[PDB]
């Protein structure tokens, strides 16, 4: 059961220090051969290796960023840390930690998305798509929010087939998307259909029941 999970602020103002944590299980550093690395990807762009720390405390840094970067570990707590000093707009990216046994990267955590902005965090408003107010298409629309990302689920994740979630659109400083599911008629409205929208940056966990009229 190898797993890796990263955590960050979600949003950070320019010039301040970014502090990322990589929590893991299924392996140990201080176990030998054994490394955890940091990789970043700006939206729709390439992957950039940042740094990695080995079991023996050997640290390796990307020269283009080196003097701003600091990797460290706490092997007893199964955690790796990355510090990025005086952060700029270009540091906006999804950050990953990944295990290195030998050779590469194998896994790969979920990523933590970071936005470098001077702006207030704004939670989303979530609205029915109801038709209209054999199979039926329903949805949740998902306006007003900052920064990215938002997570949208249906019936707390139990409804996953038929889900279509379009990519976000930025306009006037705010993002929006919509997520739709096609169910069976029989289905809805006889059974409950709920969207779960999470916005970690504003600590938002909201829910919309899809009601007919």
């Amino acid at each position: 059961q190898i797993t890796l999970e990263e955590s960050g602020p979600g949003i950070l103002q320019p010039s301040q220090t970014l502090s990322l944590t990589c929590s893991f299980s299924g392996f140990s550093l201080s176990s030998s051969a054994m490394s955890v690395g940091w990789i970043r990807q700006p939206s729709g762009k390439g992957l950039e290796w940042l740094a990695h720390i080995w079991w023996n405390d050997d640290k390796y840094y990307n020269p283009a960023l080196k003097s701003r970067l600091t990797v460290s570990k706490d092997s007893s707590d199964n955690q790796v840390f990355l510090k990025i000093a005086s952060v700029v707009t270009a540091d906006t990216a999804t950050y990953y930690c990944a295990r290195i046994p030998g050779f590469g990267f194998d896994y790969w955590g979920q990523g933590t998305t970071l936005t470098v902005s001077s702006a207030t965090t704004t939670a989303p408003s979530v609205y029915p798509l109801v038709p209209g107010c054999s199979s039926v298409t329903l949805g949740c629309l998902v306006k007003g929010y900052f920064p990215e990302p938002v997570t949208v689920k249906w019936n707390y994740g139990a409804l996953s087939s038929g889900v279509r979630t379009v990519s976000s659109v930025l306009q006037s400083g705010f993002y929006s998307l919509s997520s739709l599911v096609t169910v069976p008629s029989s289905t809805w409205p006889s059974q409950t259909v709920i969207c779960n929208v999470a916005h970690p940056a504003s600590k938002t966990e909201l829910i919309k029941r899809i009601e007919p009229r």
Partner: protein, 216 residues
């Protein structure tokens, strides 16, 4: 730094067909030890990268037989022998033999399937949005191929282009289709001013638009 050149930038593959992805190195990827550390990853839409092939040719616990790697020194190839629906996403090569560790630019692999006409749905603004002074009319083109689609909005039979935001999904993992939402956003006052609200998809499967309207 070692520059990784990936070819092609994008590939459209029919199901069951073969696909090759090239990765070329600016320096030799043979380490002193003397392994060759070239890895292949698939990043699926909305997911983190997954290791497919490590050290040129080793296929990683869980990875289907359909994926294979070959090459030596400076020239490397990922092969997918039979294309399946779930093999959608962006493929990347890593070098880890030289610091700084560098990646290829990526190859977006898209699946080429039979043509599919969209299923169109229109959604009036919700009462909860209307209560706060806003009105978004959403319309919602499900499961076309190919990706190229046009939406036209009509208010009382007159075309509207202001306040329209369009957005696509990523290609689907099971049926290989696209979806897109077109959203016309107005104020409550402006929405309450008009009656007929119309959206129409033209798509290459039909020269005639699929039209959906509500009146309120």
């Amino acid at each position: 730094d070692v520059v990784m050149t990936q070819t092609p930038l994008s590939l459209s593959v029919s199901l069951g067909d073969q696909a090759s992805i090239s990765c070329r190195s600016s320096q030799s990827l043979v380490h002193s030890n003397g392994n060759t550390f070239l890895q292949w990853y698939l990043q699926k839409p909305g997911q983190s990268p997954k290791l497919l092939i490590y050290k040129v040719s080793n296929r990683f616990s869980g990875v289907p037989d359909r994926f294979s790697g070959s090459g030596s020194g400076t020239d490397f190839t990922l092969k997918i022998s039979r294309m399946e629906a779930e093999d959608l996403g962006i493929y990347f090569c890593s070098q880890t033999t030289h610091v700084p560790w560098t990646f290829g630019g990526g190859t977006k692999l898209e699946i080429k399937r039979a043509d599919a006409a969209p299923t169109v749905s229109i959604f009036p603004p919700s009462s909860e949005q209307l209560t706060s002074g806003g009105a978004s009319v959403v319309c919602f083109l499900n499961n076309f191929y190919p990706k190229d689609i046009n939406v036209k909005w009509k208010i009382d039979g007159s075309e509207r282009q202001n306040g329209v935001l369009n957005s696509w999904t990523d290609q689907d993992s099971k049926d290989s289709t696209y979806s897109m939402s077109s959203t016309l956003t107005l104020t409550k006052d402006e929405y309450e001013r008009h009656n007929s609200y119309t959206c129409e998809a033209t798509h290459k499967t039909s020269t005639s638009p699929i039209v959906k309207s509500f009146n309120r």
